[model samples]
Target: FQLNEFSSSGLGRAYSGEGAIADDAGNVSRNPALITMFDRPTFSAGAVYIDPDVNISGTSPSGRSLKADNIAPTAWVPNMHFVAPINDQFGWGASITANDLATEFNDTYAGGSVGGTTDLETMNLNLSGAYRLNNAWSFGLGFNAVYARAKIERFAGDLGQLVAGQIMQSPAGQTQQGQALAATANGIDSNTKTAHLNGNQWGFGWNAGILYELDKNNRYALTYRSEVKIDFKGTLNLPEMWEVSGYNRVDPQWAIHYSLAYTSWKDAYRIALGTTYYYDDNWTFRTGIAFDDSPVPAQNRSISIPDQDRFWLSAGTTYAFNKDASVDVGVSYMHGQSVKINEGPYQFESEGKAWLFGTNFNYAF
Candidate 1:
C-alpha cells in the first residue's frame, strides 16, 4: 500500500530523513518545502528492482501437500522528478512514482481455493510548490493524481472435489439434471480456474508540510498526506499518512537522519535511523536500518498478502561525474517474521524475505 523506491539516495538509508532531507528533487515526494533548498533547476530519475522470496506451506485434511514457493513475483519500479527554483523564496517540483505488490500461487496447490492471485498497481503523479517564509521557515503543498489497476483470482482447488462428491450422494443425483452435473464435476481438479475479478480507476489526493531549518547543521519537518479512495466498487482504501523527520550534521562531512511515521490503520508505525558521509568532493556514502510494524493483525492475515512486521538493512553510494551530474546506487534486504495464515479450510505457515536494488542519475542546470 506504501512505497519508498522513488529515489536511490533515499533507498540507501531506508528513507530515514524523508520529509526533512533536501538532497535533491526527490524531496518533493515527501515534503515540497525541501525543494526550496535547491538553488538551481535539477532533474532526477531512478528505478528499483524488487525481488520477493515468499513461500507458503501446509497440509490438507485429506493429507494433500499444500506448498507453494516464490508466490510473489519480481517487479521493476520506476520514478522521475524535476524541481526548479523560481527565486530565492519560491520553487516548484513534479514527479512520477510506481507503487504496488502482487502475489500469485500455483494452480495445483491444495490451498488454491484460499488464494490464487491478488495484484494491484498504481502510478502516483505529484505536482508541488514551496514557499520560503524566512531563512528558517518553509511551507509546502502538493496535489496527487493516481491511476490504478487491479486483478483478483480465486480457485476451487479440492473444494471442487467436495462439491462434486456431494452432488452424487445427495437426493438430487436421482434426477437426470443431477447426473448431467455429476459428469462435469467428476473432471474437476485442484488446478481448475474458478473466478476472476478485475478493475481500474483513478484517484486524487493532497499533501502539505513545513520544514524548519534550525541552522546549517540541523533540519526538521512534518508532513501530512490525505487519503484518496478509488471507486472500485467503493473498495480502495488509501489511508492518510503522517510523519515527523529530521537530520543533524555532527561533523563537517557527516550527518545523521531519523524519521517516525504513524499510519492510522491498526496503529501501524515505522522507525528508521540513517547516516550519510560526504567522503570527498567526488563521492558520498550512506547506510541505514529500519523497523516496520504491520497494519494487518495476525488473525486477519491473508495468504495472498502474508503481510507482517519486517526489518531492513541498506547501503548506498554516490559518484559525481561532474559539477552538474551525479549518480547514486543503493541496495537493501528485508526480513519478515514467521507466521501462520488461514483461509477457509486451509492453514499455512509462512515466512518471507526480499532484496531491493536501485540506481539513479541527477543533473543540475
Candidate 2:
C-alpha cells in the first residue's frame, strides 16, 4: 500500500485536504479531548493520486538482474480547522495540511546501466487548546511546525571495457559483473570511487496531543508526535552533466575515506487510538502506531534509502449524503520492516518493499 498515496502521510496532517472531521465535534488530532466537537467553524480539501512499483535486487559484480521503472507525482494541500470561544471556559484549534515529501527511482542495466532517484519534502503547522473543568473534566494542547527536502543520484558504468582505457582521467571502471564486493572495494574515486553521483538536503520537527470523553456515545483519544531533526546543511554534487567539469570540492583530506558525511537527526513518534460509533450521525473507528528515525544511520545508509521500521493499519467512513452533503471514505495498509546493510567493503546485504492506495471526499456549510 506504499502509504496510500500520501493520504496526508497516512492519516494525520489533519487527514490532509478532503474530509475526516465531519460533525462529531470530539476534537481529537489523535487526542485532545476530540476538540470538544469544535464548540464551531471547520474546513477541508484533498487530493491523492500515486502509483509505485519498484524493484532493485542484489549481486552485480557478476550476477545480473537489477531492474527499474518508476512513474512519479504526488500532491496534497488544503485542510483547515478553526474553533474559538474564550468566555465560559476556553477553546482553540487551528490547522493547515500537507507537510512535504517526495520519492523517486529510474533504472537501466544490461551494457548501459544507469539508475537515479531520491527526493523527500515536508511542511506542517498546527496549534491547539481547550479547558472545561466541571461537567466531565477537559484539557488539551497541540503544537507542530516542520519543513524538509532531499535528493540523490546514481550511475558508475563503462570506461572502455573496465580498464583497457587505463585512467585517461579515469573513465572505465564502475564495474558490473553484478557489483558489490563492497561496490568493488570502494574505488572509482569521485569521492571514493564513481562513474556518477549527485546530492541535496534541508531541514525541521514537533508534535503534542491529549483528549478524553466517555459519554454522549463514548469517546477517547491520545496523541504524542515528536521526531524532528535535519541538520543536513548541503553540498555533495558530481559526475553527471554527461561526465565531469564542476563539483569536486569535498575533500578535507578525504575526511577519513568519506562515506558521504553531513549530519544531525533523531525523533519520530505517534501512538493513536480512536473510537466512535454513534447513531444516525457519526461513525468514527480508527487505530495507529508509529516510530520514525532513519536519517541514514549505519554510517549513512544509501544505495537509495534502505529505510526501515514502518507499520500502520486503517479504515474510514463518514456518510451524510445530505444536510450540506457528506461522503468520506478511507483505506490504509503499510508495512516495511527489513533493513540490513553489512556490505563492509561491499560484501553482501540490501533489501526493500512497498504498496499503498487511498481516496477521500467531503462538503459542508
Candidate 3:
C-alpha cells in the first residue's frame, strides 16, 4: 500500500518534513507532538488526486499469455485536521482521512483465467494530544479507529477446463479427483468457475510522536504507527460443477459455500523522519522520508494488495499569505519492488511507481 497522497500540502514536497514541519494543523496526522507549536486554534483541509498507471502480465508454463493494462484507477482522496491549544504547555487535535487501496481487471483476460475485480477501502479517525516539556522538546500520543471493507473475485474460464482436463488424463485417480474438481466447479457454468471472497469489519491501532527544536531555524520530528488486526467473518463461493459419473440426488452439487474466519488484512508498521529549515523569515524548506513494512507474507499478497516494502522521497515549500493564513505545495514519488501473484498455474507479475502532487490551505485564529 502507498499513502503519499494523504496531505495535499505534504504531497507537494513528497512529504519531506512530514512529522517535523509543524507548519499547520495537518501535522496532527503525522506528529501529534507538533500540535504544541501552535498557541492559537488552527484548521487545515485539502484533497489529493492520484493518477496511477500500473501494468500487469501473466504467463503459464505452457506459454499462454495474458495482459492487464492500467490496473489501478484514478483516485480522489480527502483529509481534514484541527488543533486547539489549551495553554502554553499542552494542545489537542483530531484528524480524519481515507486509506484507498484497490485494483480492477478487464472482464475478459487474455490469460484464459483470472478475469475479476478487487476492492479495499478504509477510513481512519484519530484523536491525539501533545505536551510541551520545554522550549526544545515535545511528546504526543494518539489512538486510531478504522473501518474497512473488502471484496475479491477470480473467474475461471479456459483455466478451469485445463485443470479438469488434466485430472481426467490421470487414469488411476479419475473418479475421486474428478469428483473433487467437480465440487470445485460447482458454481461455474458457461461463464466458467468463479471464486468469490468478501468481508467488512472494524479495527483499532495506536501511534506516538516526538518533536525537537534544534535551534531557532531547525526542527526535527519522528513518529511510529502500530498495525491493527481485523478478524473478518467472510463468505467464499465456489464454482458450479457436477460429477460426471452421476448427478447424485443425495448431494446435488451446484456451488459449494463455506464460512470464512480469516484476517481480511494484516497490519504493517510505518516510520517517518523529517526536518524543516527556516532559510530566512519569508523562506522555508523541508525534506523527509518514510517507509512502510509489508503487511502480509509474499505468498499471501493478492490482487487487492500487491503490497511490497515501499519508500517515499519528497521535497516542498510553504509560502506565507499573511499572519493568519498560508499555503503549502509539495511533490513526491513512490517506488516499490516487483510483486508476484501466484494462483495455481496462473502466475501474474506487477510493479508500481506513483507521482503525487498536492496543495493545502491552513488558517489560524
Candidate 4:
C-alpha cells in the first residue's frame, strides 16, 4: 500500500506533486485527470529496486531464543503507462504496476510460525479517460483490474521439552522408544514445514479525480483510488501542488512540489516537500524529504508486517535527450521506528530501514 515506488519521475520529490503534474504518461498512474496534459501519444516504463534491512528479536513460547536478521528479501517492482489524445477535449490512458513484496527466514528460526516466508504478488491494470471541461477544469475516471497471488507458510521450531513431554505421554508414545521419537517430533531434525497457504485471484475497483489548473505553471489536484478486494483488499486521497517558484527570486524559476497523502488508518498521513532546479533546458535536479505515519497501530502489529512510521530522504535527476524523450532517476532512504509486537505466547521487537532506487524511461510519438 505504498505508492512511493510507482515511477521515478516523481520519486525524487517523494511523490509530492505526482498527482498534479503531467511529467509524462507516468502521471496517469497517479491521477488520470492529468492525462489531458499530453498532446501527443506518450509512453513511460519504469522499474524500482527495493531493499529492506529488517531484524526481529524475541523469545518463543517454548523459549528457545527467537531471532532473525534481515528477514525481508530484496525485490523489484516494474510498471508501464501510455496516454493518447483522441482529440483536443478527450484523452485516454492505460497503465500497469507490479508490486511483488516478499519476506523470508532461516528454516529453523524460532519465529517460524510467523516468519517462514510470506509473499504477495500484485499487478494493477487500469484503463482511464480524461476530459477537459474548460481551460481551468479537467475530470477523470478509471476502471481497475487487479491480479494477485499469495504464498504463505509456517514451521515448527524448538517445540520444547515440556510440550514434547505431553506428546511422549500420549497413548501412542507408551515406550522409551516412543518417548525418544516424540522428542524428535519437536525441533529442526523432526519438523520443518508444518503448514502452508497459497492462492491466486482477480479483483476490480474504480477511481476518480479532478484537476484545477490555475495556470500553465501552477496546478492543484484531488484524487481517489478505491479499494480492490484481491479475493483480497485498499483507499485513500491525495491533494497536491506543482508550481514554478521564485526560490528567493532572480528567474532561475525552480519547480516547487508539495503533497499530503491521506490514510484512513486512524487518520494517518504523509507530508512531503521537494524542489526541482532547472540547471539548463536539458538537465534537471530534484530532491525531497517526507514524513509519514504507519497504518498499523502498536497493539495490532505483527512480526510478518512490522510496519512503522518513517521518514524518507531522496534525490535524483532528469535528463532530456530532446523534446521527444527524457529519463529520470531517483533514490530514497527510509528510516523506520522500532516497535513491540505481542503475538499469542510470543513477544518481539522489530526495527528496520530501507533503500529504493528507481528510473523511468519516457518518450513521445
Candidate 5:
C-alpha cells in the first residue's frame, strides 16, 4: 500500500512484539482510561520519515494520450505532547503534530504534440485536550484546522505540430489556420500555455474521546475526531503572450471544496488496547495494538492519496535512569487496506503501505 492511517514507525516489523509497549507510551493514549493512570506530568517528543514511490498513467478527456511517473519527495514529521494530572479528580493535556492532511500530483504526458502538466499539495494541523474522570476513566476533546492549495498547467505547439492537432475553438485574438487565420482569429496553436485556477482555504472542527482501565496493567481507549471542511479560492495569472492571441480567458470564481471532508468521526474511530507490566524498579515493558479508520471518503480518493483503514501492532520499553528522567523506545506496524477505483477511462489500484520506527524522551521537574 502507498499510504497508511498511522505513522510508519508505528508499523515497522522491527518493533512488532508483545513486549513492545513497555518502552512506548504514545499509542496507549488512544483510550482515555490509560491517561488517568498518569500521576505525574508526562512529555513525549518524536519524528517520522517516509520514502514513497508513486506512478500515474491515463488518457485525457480530449482524446490525447498521457503518462507520468516520479518518486514523492521524502516526507518528515516531528511531534510533541504534554499531559498533567488534575488533583487525582481530573487531567489535562495537549498534542502538536503534522496531520498528513494533503497530497501532490505532478504529471507530464504527450497528447498529440501538446504536452500538459499538473501539480497539487495540501496539509493540516490540530490542537486538542481531555479530562480524567478518575484513575479508571477519562474523556477528551479537540479541533482540526486545515489549509490546502493546487495548480494545473498545459502547453501547446510542439515541434511536431502536436499542439496544432489538439486545437479547439480559439479565444478573442489568435491567428486562424495558416494565412487565412490572422492574429485576430483566436484559433488553436501548435503550443499554448494555460494555467488552471489555483487557491487555498481554512476549516475547523471538534471531537471527543473516552478511556477505561480494565485493571492495573491493561486498558482500552476510544476516540472520535471530527471532520472540517475548507473553501478553495484564488486568482489565475494568464500567460501574457496568450492574452494577445485574442482568447476570452475564463475568469475563475471562488470554489468550495472540502479539504478536510474526510470521515474522521462518522466512519473513523481510533481504538487502542494497551498494557504496562512493571518488571522491576529499574525497567518496565509496554505493549499495544490499535485500529484507526480512513478519514477520506471512498468516492473521492486519488492515486496520490490511497486512503484506507489501518491496523497497528506495537511494543516498546522504558528504562528509569534516574528519579527525574527515563528513556522510551517503540516500534509499530500500521498497515493500510488496499483500494480499487474505476474512474472514467482510467482504472487504478492504490496499493498503499508504510514502515515506521520511533524514539521518545521525557523528563520531570
Candidate 6:
C-alpha cells in the first residue's frame, strides 16, 4: 500500500510530473511550489482501488509447510487537496491522504496451532505554502502530521512447540532435550491457543520542494520528504505451553504478558524529480522517477514488514475539459529487491512490485 493513488492526474503517468506539472490542486501534496501556477482557488479529489496478489511459502522443522495465495486484500485509498493563490507572489494549500502501506496475511501451518495474520495502515495531513521568487523559480515548504495503526496474531499447537524446542537445543535435533521435548509434546496434544498484538500512534515530519520553469510549456520540479517515527506501545498475550507426561505436569514460562514498546516504527525518506511538457491547449505529457530509502535495516526488519529500498518509474497525460475543469490520467510501476528476514520465531522471504492506475477530477472556483 505505498500510496501511489494520491492524484489520478499523476497516476496515468505514474506521477512523473507530480511537482512541476500543476495540472490540478493535487500538486499541493507533491510540490507546493507548483501551486503558483494556479491563479484562482482550485480543488481535486480522487481514490484508487488496489488489489495485490502476493504469495507466501515456508516450512517448519517438522517438514510442515503452507503456500498462501493473494495474501493481500483489495483496498480503496482516498485523497483530497485544495490550493489558493494570494496575489501573485505566494500561494497556500492543504491535503489529506493515506500514503503508506496497507497489507494483511493469514494462514494455517502444519507445525503451529492454527496460523497468524498481520495488518498495517497509515494516513497524513499536510499544510503548505509556496513563494514565487521570479519569472522562472519558486520555493515551497510544508508540515506533515501522520497517523498509523497495526494488528498481528499468531497461534501454535503442541507439535509446533515440539519442533521449536528441537531446533533450539540442536540443529541436528538428536539431543536428549529434543527427545524429552517430543515426549512432552504428546501430553499437550489438545493444547492450542491464539496470541494477538495491536497498537496505534501518531508521528510528524516535514517536506520541501523547488520548481524551475524553463518556459510556459516546460518545467522541472524536485521534492524531498523527511521520515517520521512513531513509538508504538501494545499488549502481548499468548497461551502458556505445558508439559504433561509420566504422572508429571509442568508449566513453562511460555505464557506472555507484557507492555511492548515498538520503537522501530519509522518512515523512510523520499526524493522525486519530474518534468512536464505542454503539447498544446488540450494536451500535456509528463515523466519522472522517485526513490525511497529503506525505513528499517536488515537486522531490524520484522515479519510484519519485510520491506527494502523502493524505486518507481512513471508517465501520464491530462486533458482539459474547459476553463474551469479538466481530467488527468496516469500510470506507474514500482519495484523492490527481495528481502529475507529471520525474526524471533518467524522467517520470511518477500519481494514486492506494483502496477498503478490513477484518474482525478479537478476544478477551479
Best by lDDT: 1
Judging by TM-score, tell me the better candidate of 3 and 4. 4
Worst 10 residues of 5 by lDDT: 238-247
**lDDT (tens digit, per residue) of candidate 4 on 1-365:** 44436788767777676777676788777788888889899999989888989899987756567788898888888978999998899999999887766778776777766677877778888999999999988888899887778787777656554357567668857878777767665544313787787877787888877888877777888878776665533122222212221111123657776777676634567777788888887898888898788876767777876478988898989899999899989998988888888865578888999999999998999
lDDT of each: 0.86, 0.38, 0.64, 0.76, 0.44, 0.62
**Which digits, one per residue and each the tens of the lDDT, describe model 2 over residues 1-365?**
01113233234221321112224222233333345545444444454433333344444443334333332334443444455545456666655444333344443341122334555554445676767665555565666554444554444433222333333224333444323333443344322222343323332333343333344322333344444544555432111100000111123211000001111333222232322232354333333333333444564444454355555454555566555454445554444554544332222234443333334443434
Question: How do all models score by TM-score?
Answer: 0.92, 0.30, 0.75, 0.87, 0.59, 0.72
Candidate 1 lDDT for residue 233: 41
Ranking by TM-score: 1, 4, 3, 6, 5, 2
Leading candidate by TM-score: 1
Candidate 5 lDDT over 84-156, as tens digits, reads 6666666555555453422334323333122243334434344445566656666666555655455444444
Shift in Å, residue 319, candidate 6: 3.2
TM-score, model 5 to reference: 0.59
Error of 5 at 45 (Å): 0.9
**Model 2: runs farther than 4 Å from truth?**
1-21, 24-37, 40-53, 56-123, 127-146, 158-330, 333-365
C-alpha lDDT of residue 184 in model 3: 62
Flag the better candidate by TM-score, 1 or 2: 1
Candidates ranked, most accurate by lDDT first: 1, 4, 3, 6, 5, 2
- The stretch of ten residues in a row with the least summed lDDT in candidate 1 is 156-165
User: How does residue 292 of candidate 3 score in lDDT?
Assistant: 65
Per-residue lDDT tens digits for candidate 6, residues 201-283, read: 88777777777777665566666666576677862111111110010011121111111011123545545555456666777
How far off is model 1, as Cα RMSD? 2.8
| Alpha-carbon RMSD, each predicted model | 2.8, 18.9, 15.5, 4.8, 14.4, 15.6
